[PDB]
Amino acid sequence: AYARTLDRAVEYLLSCQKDEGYWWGPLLSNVTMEAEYVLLCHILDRVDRDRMEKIRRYLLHEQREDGTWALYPGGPPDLDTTIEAYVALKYIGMSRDEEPMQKALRFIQSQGGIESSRVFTRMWLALVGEYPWEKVPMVPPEIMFLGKRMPLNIYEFGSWARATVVALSIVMSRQPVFPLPERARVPELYETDVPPRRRGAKGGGGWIFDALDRALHGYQKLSVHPFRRAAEIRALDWLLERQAGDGSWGGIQPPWFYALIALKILDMTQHPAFIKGWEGLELYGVELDYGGWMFQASISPVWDTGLAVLALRAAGLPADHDRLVKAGEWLLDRQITVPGDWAVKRPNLKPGGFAFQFDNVYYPDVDDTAVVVWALNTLRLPDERRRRDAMTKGFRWIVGMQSSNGGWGAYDVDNTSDLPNHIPFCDFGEVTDPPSEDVTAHVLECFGSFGYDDAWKVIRRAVEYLKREQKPDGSWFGRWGVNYLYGTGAVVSALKAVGIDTREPYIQKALDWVEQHQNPDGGWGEDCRSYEDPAYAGKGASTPSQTAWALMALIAGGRAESEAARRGVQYLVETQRPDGGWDEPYYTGTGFPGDFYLGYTMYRHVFPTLALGRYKQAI
Amino acid sequence: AYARTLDRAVEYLLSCQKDEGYWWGPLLSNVTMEAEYVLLCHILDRVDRDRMEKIRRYLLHEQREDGTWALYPGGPPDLDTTIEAYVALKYIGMSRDEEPMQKALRFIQSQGGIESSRVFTRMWLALVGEYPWEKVPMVPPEIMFLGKRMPLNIYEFGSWARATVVALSIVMSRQPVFPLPERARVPELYETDVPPRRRGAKGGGGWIFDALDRALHGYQKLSVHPFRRAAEIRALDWLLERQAGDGSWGGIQPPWFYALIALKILDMTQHPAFIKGWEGLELYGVELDYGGWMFQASISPVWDTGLAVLALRAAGLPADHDRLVKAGEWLLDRQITVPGDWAVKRPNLKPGGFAFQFDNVYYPDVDDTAVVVWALNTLRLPDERRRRDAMTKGFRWIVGMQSSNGGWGAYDVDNTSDLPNHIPFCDFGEVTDPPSEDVTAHVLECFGSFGYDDAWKVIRRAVEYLKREQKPDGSWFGRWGVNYLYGTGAVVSALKAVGIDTREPYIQKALDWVEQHQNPDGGWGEDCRSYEDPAYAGKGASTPSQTAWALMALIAGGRAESEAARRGVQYLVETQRPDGGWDEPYYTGTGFPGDFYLGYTMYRHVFPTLALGRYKQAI
Numbered sequence A, B: 001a002y003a004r005t006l007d008r009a010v011e012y013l014l015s016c017q018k019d020e021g022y023w024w025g026p027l028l029s030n031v032t033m034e035a036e037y038v039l040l041c042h043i044l045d046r047v048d049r050d051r052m053e054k055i056r057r058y059l060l061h062e063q064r065e066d067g068t069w070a071l072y073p074g075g076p077p078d079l080d081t082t083i084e085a086y087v088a089l090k091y092i093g094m095s096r097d098e099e100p101m102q103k104a105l106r107f108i109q110s111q112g113g114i115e116s117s118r119v120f121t122r123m124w125l126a127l128v129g130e131y132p133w134e135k136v137p138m139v140p141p142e143i144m145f146l147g148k149r150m151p152l153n154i155y156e157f158g159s160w161a162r163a164t165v166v167a168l169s170i171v172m173s174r175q176p177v178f179p180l181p182e183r184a185r186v187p188e189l190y191e192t193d194v195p196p197r198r199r200g201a202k203g204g205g206g207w208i209f210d211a212l213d214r215a216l217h218g219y220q221k222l223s224v225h226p227f228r229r230a231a232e233i234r235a236l237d238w239l240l241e242r243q244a245g246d247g248s249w250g251g252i253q254p255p256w257f258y259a260l261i262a263l264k265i266l267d268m269t270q271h272p273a274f275i276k277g278w279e280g281l282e283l284y285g286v287e288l289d290y291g292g293w294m295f296q297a298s299i300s301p302v303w304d305t306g307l308a309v310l311a312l313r314a315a316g317l318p319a320d321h322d323r324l325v326k327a328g329e330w331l332l333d334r335q336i337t338v339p340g341d342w343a344v345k346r347p348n349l350k351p352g353g354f355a356f357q358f359d360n361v362y363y364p365d366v367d368d369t370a371v372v373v374w375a376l377n378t379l380r381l382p383d384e385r386r387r388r389d390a391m392t393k394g395f396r397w398i399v400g401m402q403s404s405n406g407g408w409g410a411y412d413v414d415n416t417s418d419l420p421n422h423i424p425f426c427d428f429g430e431v432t433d434p435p436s437e438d439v440t441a442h443v444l445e446c447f448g449s450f451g452y453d454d455a456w457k458v459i460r461r462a463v464e465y466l467k468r469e470q471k472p473d474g475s476w477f478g479r480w481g482v483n484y485l486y487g488t489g490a491v492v493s494a495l496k497a498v499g500i501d502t503r504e505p506y507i508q509k510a511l512d513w514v515e516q517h518q519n520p521d522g523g524w525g526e527d528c529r530s531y532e533d534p535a536y537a538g539k540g541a542s543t544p545s546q547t548a549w550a551l552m553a554l555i556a557g558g559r560a561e562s563e564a565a566r567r568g569v570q571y572l573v574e575t576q577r578p579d580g581g582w583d584e585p586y587y588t589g590t591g592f593p594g595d596f597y598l599g600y601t602m603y604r605h606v607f608p609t610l611a612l613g614r615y616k617q618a619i
């Protein structure tokens, strides 16, 4: 019955695989990427009219009827996003008259204008001279002098925030302005009567930092700042040492863009670091069939590859399938063998992790590492020496990453400080990298493949962790995936792999929760609003990935041969396309709960296959 | 009469000009470049058998009958060079038997073997495990902690030595060893009875440094070295910040090669700086028609271009010649506009100099700057705004570079410390960059084109400088050109340009000196031995360049219409080739008096043209 669905899905994945043997689907986000890029170009004075065009199409193409832009397809209009997209268009050419501009300008005003945008947005606008720098939360270069065990040293921040700060300090240190031609000045972003509803720090703001900031803007005005030069150079050097191989920084849009600006600021446009960082951009860009052009927030080659492999293996293909070997080999060449920022906390830990993207050695992550190591563990490669060796190196690296609570973060160990979450500057996304349920689940699911059960202390410390985090309704939060369906699926699936009894009370309380949210159409769906409004937990239009997720929780919990179970399987089998693929007009990936969402292109194809492959095991 | 010679010579230079509008002749040195490269490859574990071949032919091709290699064509066999070339060949394949090997081996032994080679040679051999590191002069990473005004801080060294030291500290800090396959081990470099005649420090060795070194090799043995990590990183950063645009480091073979090794040491082979630095090498390499391959010590695009222009202008071509405009424009794009290491002494001086090579922003030199600015001053470019502006920036930069004695160094101001010249490590070439007569001459010759005469204090301070340096016989030393013929020509030519009276006593005493060394063939020649043995001052086989030099001194001194004068002109006119060029099987360029010599490929063509062009002015 469902078989045909598999054979079609399988042959589809293999058709998407690149020559080198890996998979790599685009990563969708929102239009701030492309908008900030446009500004970056203006800043660096490298504007290509042809690109500006492809970029204008995209922006318009992503604009909804109301004339706004959201963070995810079918999401509430976002102010920040829309503001940035607005300025971008006006620069490219658009006149404040054009209906599209009109609608957006009104939405923006009805919200309180620029005065209500996130720090970043205001900062960018500050960079082009459309906003006072004084009203921008200050982050000083001197921050570079904080020791390893002090309040607010750069290592109290999550990896992604860290580099961003380092880069910015240099920028905010000079507070440079790159004038926009009159033709695009946007004073109209001020023209508003509505009260400027401002967003505060993430976990609240203590009058302390609030004062401190005021102090910094004051000190920033003096004629002489002792050791500032040294602070800056410290920052610059920190950047030059960590520049990724593809010329980026962390393989992420934010710090990368800032670093470049910072270098421009220091007249190092003719320095290797800058040149490479500049040309490396093209790799993250993407041509759109409808003429548009988009820039990726990041790239998921490794990630996509790892999953694709597990899906195909769980599906049916032989452990030694020649096509799955290209992958295996490719993955082995990817393993990072040098100390990254993580070494700051684990100086005696041997390198052995993997990164999300192609070449990012200083920031391998636990999630990627776990999936890769586990994927390889299911293959029979030619060189059993390197396969045996690599798995062991990664395995021990993961074990040495486990945080205090027995959980697993993404990039660092016990990066659970709270200080950063109160700074005036941090009003967007996460700023720290504490352990999460989903990353942890994947890790256990990995060890489980080797056989390590609940007997091993490391496993116990982790299980206890999850057990304490489980939500009242028996659900599990989804940190890097939308959302409870994502997390719960991961957890139940993992706990089943480490030997735990699938009959347990808290376990059953989780499976019930799943069946209870199965949409009429037989599938499962969870909208990104579930991060803002609890009423959306497990509620949303059914999607291929999210369905496969809830499906895995059921198959793992033993309820494989259930109604709701067979029901879902029907959904996937039907909704499948003629080519063997699947569609998913919704985001199921999470960047920052409630602030930044992602659209993983391979999910719609990989997970459904993995889900089916396991349902085929259950029979 | 001579006219035809010019027309031929002129059309020749115009034929060698590249499309972009610049000239660029290869720079010849000795085989240590190619030999160290081979080792570099072995170190970095990137050996291309096809390249090794091209390199073998070269090495053999440059070996003389006796089975040795010298520093210049027709020069005494050099031990260091030969030793390195020897090891190189043995690695490539050669067996210690092969006649070429046998002859070299014996020469090496008759000299005391490896124990008599310069520090560098022994160090390289140390790197591959064929020599004890303990016997290698120690240069610690900690040197990075010396303040700007302290004994032996990195800024007391000449630019070229500085970077070399910084790179090495990191290396000597780890004292790594990269084993050679048994097949190429060279213990036979020890098999000798002759006493190990060792070379000491440049300006002598005080028992202090001698003991200090011993101290270091001892401290180097301890189990813990406090702040060493910080010392290394200081070095690494210093290197990362200064890496040239073409991925080199100063546009010179030494530091470039070491930096790469140092990076390899720190497992940064997957870092942009390393990658770019690695691929940058190919640009300095050269394919030889006879199948060989050579690596340039540096590249002289700018330099060649500047001179070629002056030669052609002095010859006859219009100041607005479309072909000379390509050059002018190209040169304008070359001007450096950012602070280089020189800024450490002149923080208030505005950037405006030029570099020897294509892209080396942190090390513009006075010589290049003077020639370029002066060359432009003789052109009529389309954008008189940038030509007027540029010349001004360069002019002021040069002025702000004049050292204390009124003289001009090459890269720094008053870089005349003496401490460095006594270190155990510095036993090869120069280690400081004090003002020289030749660089100074070119500078005056430059201002002179604008009109600034002896009235201006700057000029006076410089003239007095030269006047005090002039040798007893009325000759002038040649720092960057072989030798007294080179210097004297430059000086007399310059002094004539700044208004000084060509009838003066010391002046006439210089011209007489020239005429007194004119070879029978009617030309002038000065062998590189004139740096070692005074009996060779103005003695040696006549060459096209050196002749044109002595010729310029005569034309400038007023004795243009002389016997010796017209005599030389005859030489050039005759020795000229059918194509309009000239040959020169001898080196007329100086890298380090008595230690390193260069072969400037364009000299044979440019100077003869310039000399004639001026003799045509004298009529």
Ligand SMILES: C=CCN(C)CCCCCCOc1ccc2c(-c3ccc(Br)cc3)nn(C)c2c1
Binding pocket: A160, A161, A162, A164, A165, A252, A253, A254, A255, A297, A298, A303, A356, A365, A367, A368, A410, A426, A428, A429, A430, A431, A480, A591, A596
């Ligand atoms: C499960 C997969 C592996 N996982 C491990 C990697 C997936 C995350 C990478 C994509 C997210 O990229 C980012 C990463 C960081 C940011 C920031 C940001 C926010 C606050 C500060 Br302070 C600095 C930057 N803004 N935006 C859009 C960002 C986008």
Ligand SMILES: C=CCN(C)CCCCCCOc1ccc2c(-c3ccc(Br)cc3)nn(C)c2c1
Binding pocket: B160, B161, B164, B252, B253, B254, B255, B297, B298, B303, B356, B365, B367, B368, B410, B426, B428, B429, B430, B431, B480, B591, B596
């Ligand atoms: C007149 C032209 C402009 N002039 C201004 C530049 C010409 C000089 C550049 C070629 C010489 O390049 C070098 C420059 C430096 C070195 C060293 C060296 C010597 C001692 C130490 Br300590 C470190 C390096 N070894 N070798 C072969 C070297 C070769």
Ligand SMILES: CCCCCCCCOCCOCCOCCOCCO
Binding pocket: A229, A232, A233, A236, A266, B241, B242, B339, B340, B341, B343, B344, B362
């Ligand atoms: C990173 C601080 C930027 C300010 C430095 C520019 C001012 C000049 O400093 C004096 C000496 O430094 C000159 C060296 O050039 C080396 C490259 O290092 C990069 C930034 O200058």
Ligand SMILES: CCCCCCCCOCCOCCOCCOCCO
Binding pocket: A241, A242, A339, A340, A341, A342, A343, A344, A362, B229, B232, B233, B266, B268
């Ligand atoms: C300069 C020390 C070289 C010794 C290698 C050990 C590396 C330890 O680095 C400290 C940990 O921080 C890791 C950060 O990423 C930066 C890498 O810089 C590269 C060379 O150290």
